[PDB]
Amino acid sequence: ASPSINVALKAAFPSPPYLVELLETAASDNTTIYYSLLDRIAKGHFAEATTDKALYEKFLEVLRDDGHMDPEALSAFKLALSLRTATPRVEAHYQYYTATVEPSLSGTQEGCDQWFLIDGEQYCSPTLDTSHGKVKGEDQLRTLPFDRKFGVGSRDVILYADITSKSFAPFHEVAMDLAKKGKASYRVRYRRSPSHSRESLSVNGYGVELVLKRTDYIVIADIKPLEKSELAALGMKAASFVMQSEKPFEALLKLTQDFPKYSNSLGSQNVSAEFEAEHRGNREVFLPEGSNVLWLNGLHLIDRQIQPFGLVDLLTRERKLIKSVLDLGLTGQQAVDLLGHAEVAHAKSGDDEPRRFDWRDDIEEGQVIIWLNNLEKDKRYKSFSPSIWVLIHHFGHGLPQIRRDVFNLVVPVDLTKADDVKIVVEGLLSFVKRLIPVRFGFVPLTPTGQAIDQAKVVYYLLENYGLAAATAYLEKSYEEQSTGQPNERIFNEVIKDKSLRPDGVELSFKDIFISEKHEKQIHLSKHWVERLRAGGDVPTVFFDGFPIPRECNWLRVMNHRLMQDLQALQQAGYFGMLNESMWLPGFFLEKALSRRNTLIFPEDKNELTVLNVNKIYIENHDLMSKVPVIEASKESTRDDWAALTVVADLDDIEGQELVYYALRFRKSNDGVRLDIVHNPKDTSRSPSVLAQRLKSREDKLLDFTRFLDLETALETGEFEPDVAYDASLANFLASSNMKAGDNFVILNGRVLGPITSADDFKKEDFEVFLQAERRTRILPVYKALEDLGLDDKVSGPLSAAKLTSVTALSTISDLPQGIFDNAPTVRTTLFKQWNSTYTSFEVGDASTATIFFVAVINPASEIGQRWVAVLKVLSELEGVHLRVFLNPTVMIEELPVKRFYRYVLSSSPSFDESGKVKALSARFTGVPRETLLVVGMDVPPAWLVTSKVAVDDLDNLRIKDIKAKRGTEHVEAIYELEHILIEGHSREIPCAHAPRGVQLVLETENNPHFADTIIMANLGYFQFKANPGVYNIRLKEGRSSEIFTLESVGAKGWGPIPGDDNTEVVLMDFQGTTLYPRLRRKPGMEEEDVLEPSVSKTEHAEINIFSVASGHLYERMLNIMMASVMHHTNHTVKFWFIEQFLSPSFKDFIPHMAAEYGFKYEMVTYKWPHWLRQQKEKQREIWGYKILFLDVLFPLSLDKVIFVDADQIVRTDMYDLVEHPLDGAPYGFAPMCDSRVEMEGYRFWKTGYWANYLKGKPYHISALYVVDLQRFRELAAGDRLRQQYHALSADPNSLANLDQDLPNHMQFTIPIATLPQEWLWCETWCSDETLKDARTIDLCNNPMTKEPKLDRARRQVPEWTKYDEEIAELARRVREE
């Protein structure tokens, strides 16, 4: 009965058959569920269900009956099925099939509905007698993201099927059995089924907003009554309303959805009931008022993760983790409590801290490091104080001078290499001369003959003659001979003068092979380099025992730690830890290790892989119950307990050497439980045989006095291959992402490898690996666990590993730190302190719940509107517990909620009267008749959405006008999910920086140019607009491919995860594709793209003009603007539009404008980056679109573009603007008119702020401008605009009209070519005499009148009507066509 508004969203691809959708949703990533269901439908079991409802009904009985899902998992299935999560996954198959399969399968297809692909041969029959073709193109056997494999088999078989028909069932069974036997491995790919219709897909999981566009007024429903500004209590009274109700959850939803309407309805019926000013005892301890914060089992979630898709994926990952834990008899409540424990979080913070290695000469008896300094005895520093209090009493970024030993830097240098030598001579010495408070040492590198000799030479020269003489040889050699090889012509000259009085033990001269000097010194040096792995292609520098690889600007890194170490000393001083007679460098060396392993302590800190241990012994029970196992001792303690697994190729020396060390390590440590997995490179001979050889010797293991006893044990015995073992073996490696013939080590779930050489991992290396690992992962689990009194649940080394391995996996973020939020992955328990009686309410059983949600919502917030709606639907799930906290603010200067909100989402699917799946819509009932509203879509981050069907103005909605024009009080609008984003964050390799100005191309097998974009400075950001399918990213041919080669697109994560050295992107989700690509510079380049060492016209048009309109009037005026151009030029024109701000009425009309006026048009858009600062006010968004994304909004093929405002009219042939010389400037603008005489008062750009800032420069107009795009990108102007905007935008009153203000604020930095004023006319600021020579007219605002825009046009321009008539009759001609 009430006046309503209905909004629906539909995808850009047709709806896949429901059957296949349920298969995919059902078996998320468990393959067994997939094929176990694929059997069921190949019976013809699902043939008897006629309707989607019945079909859906059937799946529930099946899953429950076959043991696939429990209540918790079934409930999760329904929600994910509502969300239609599996539909893009299915469309991936189709797009792949349409674009790579069909054009590479030459011949005549008839009867080949289904067909296996074997050895590039197609078989249309199960009986497999005849093969139709040799398939053209690249291999289809590449395993890609949407693939599934069933069984292990040498041969690989693929079936492209249309499951829908009965023709499928026999084909399946042929290969299911073939895989069951073990002949080959089975996988299914899809074929678009023509039994189904081409109807588009109706989506859900988004939000709709109705924004009040007039907020100025403040002192069933007609209009909101504006109430006297007693805003301050809204949050507080609003919070009480709910608490009082006692059906609280529903109140908040009902209140929060229509909140603007209920503002004046609050403060009534002795309203405050402020018992809860009590709970700011809650505020006093933890969070600030009016802040929204969500936690999921301690995990603090960012806003972007708080959508239905983001949340479904989190539960899925979390339950897998918890279920693993609760097979050891822990309640969901106990499990979570252990995960978020204080001792656990402390450990993460603990090894976020730096680990140091002992850089001293002590082991090598002081004969390896050749220092250029001594700060306690150098008579340069003599002037300085040797006092501790010099350190402690410091502030700033300046280096404190001191005569003390406190900071050291040891840099290993190769004396053959010029660049290396140059470091010492220029780099190291300047620092000395400069009186820096750092001691500088260097140790030569000995990887070649010449290097060995030159270390000897320099070492000798130091020993007898001294530092200066040695220094001297080095300096002279660098300039003089310019090579590593020793030069006597250079050497002898040095001794000639520098050989005066070589003290102590005498010089021997001429030739060196001192038994001691060559042996001891060089081999001691080698022992130092080897010990700390300070050599290779990339050497390692040690500052205060902290490894810094010799790359990029390592001194920048050193300076960072130098200040960070100083602050570490200061704090010990204020606690009085320090004293005057102390060796300060040993404050750092307290916990330092003598030996450094790059595997255990990788210098890429992120590099860490942990596996779920319970999973490993559950999935591969067949394998792990038949591996040689050394049980850890009967009589050893819980603290001693640890579990180790060695994966090695026993057909290689390195593989068997590695195991000997592991066995040795086991003899010493009684607490460890060892497992041996034989992973061979060549699988011609069964892996089961060598495993069977050892399990017989299992009892006798580690009784190998010598290595050959192990070697011999491998050779002897006759065995029968357990081919069941072999199958589980190759499944394990596939699950664990391990290659064949690769060596790996696993202690308590953590993987290190591949081990190329067994010398890398020795007995001593296992000991530290256990020592370190023990500390972090095991000791925080043990304490925490015991604190809760769950320490009864640990029954052995394997029992313990399950827990420790699970809790290590809990703290690994999905999102790399520094991108979406800087904050680390630390699970807080800090809200448990909070009193709950009067602000909290809980939903779901805590006793049974596996999922625990903690929401802190401010009722007055607009963000809260979304949060409540989503959380209500996730609360409906069984096995989920939710607890809500309401926290309003007293600080309300402006109206808090200025919109109505509806979230389109259901917890379980809805069905038709005819049993089809119900589409979901946002229906607003009882909308005020007199309020002007704006329709907005609050869509998940990866989505790009535009209006498709609407007859109304969504920018200016009013029921009274629609009623008086259309006769209906009911509004319906349909949107289209046109694109889904592929977005990523780039980095250069190895010295990781964002490559800006790099150009990229997206491609498909059908077309080599889907899309193109350029790399941004901020986070090496880039994006593409695409739909489900298989794509590839190639650097654009030109300068980009000249300078770089991209090793990878980061599709597996930040990584590098092995197996990701790929450039293939696929999108099979509503979350799009997130990528972290890597690019390494080609041989010796410090080059830059941005600086140099008829195309666009042909592709597009003579003239390229772009614009935006945000109303029916402005779109009507835009039609006139385009026409005026056309009449005024005998040239070719192409028009460009900002797609999402335009009406469907306008969108449906243009082809008709294009046919009549003879122009070309193209729709463009870009999605506002997540890092870039948003605009809550739509008009401001629009302005941002014209200036912020100029370089990335238009294809690279476009040389230049021109912006013309919608209200404008042009009498000029527009080419002239193209030909206008810009004098090497990126863009050109026209200034403000000075010509009108008496207008001055309203000329605000002659005031203090604008005249002080614009010293001599003009105040420009954003109605018309030229962008020399090629130059724009070349100058990388965009990046500067974007970062200045982001920086300025922190202040809300910063840019009145950003579009005009940003180019004006940046004209110092970025040149603006100024235009002849023949180019702009405006009555308000230009004289009437001026318009004779006027080229174009903007209709700028009155403001000494109130005459409106429609009036100015008719009065100001007589030919405006002529243009309007032309459009008017055509629109009617179309309507009557």
Ligand SMILES: *[C@@H]1O[C@H](CO)[C@@H](O[C@@H]2O[C@H](CO)[C@@H](O[C@@H]3O[C@H](CO)[C@@H](O)[C@H](O)[C@@H]3O)[C@H](O)[C@H]2NC(C)=O)[C@H](O)[C@H]1NC(C)=O
């Ligand atoms: C992937 O799906 C399969 C099949 O649905 C899951 O396997 C099933 O796991 C259950 C345990 O949840 C097995 O039941 C029993 O487990 C106990 C464990 O102690 C064991 O002692 C019993 O003998 C029995 O196996 C069940 O047999 C097994 N298969 C089926 C058809 O139910 C598997 O857990 C799923 N994987 C993931 C990642 O969840």
Ligand SMILES: *[C@@H]1O[C@H](CO)[C@@H](O)[C@H](O)[C@H]1NC(C)=O
């Ligand atoms: C209702 O509020 C008024 C004003 O604060 C107060 O005088 C009155 O006592 C309240 N009613 C009750 C039942 O306490």
Ligand SMILES: *[C@@H]1O[C@H](CO)[C@@H](O)[C@H](O)[C@H]1NC(C)=O
């Ligand atoms: C929680 O309430 C109790 C009882 O009034 C009080 O003693 C305690 O301090 C409160 N906690 C906080 C942090 O306000």
Ligand SMILES: *[C@@H]1O[C@H](CO)[C@@H](O)[C@H](O)[C@H]1NC(C)=O
């Ligand atoms: C304190 O002074 C003593 C005495 O000279 C010295 O041996 C030591 O380095 C200092 N610190 C401690 C912990 O004794």
Ligand SMILES: *[C@@H]1O[C@H](CO)[C@@H](O)[C@H](O)[C@H]1NC(C)=O
């Ligand atoms: C278009 O072409 C005609 C014929 O050559 C010419 O007379 C006319 O002036 C041209 N239009 C304009 C405005 O340049």
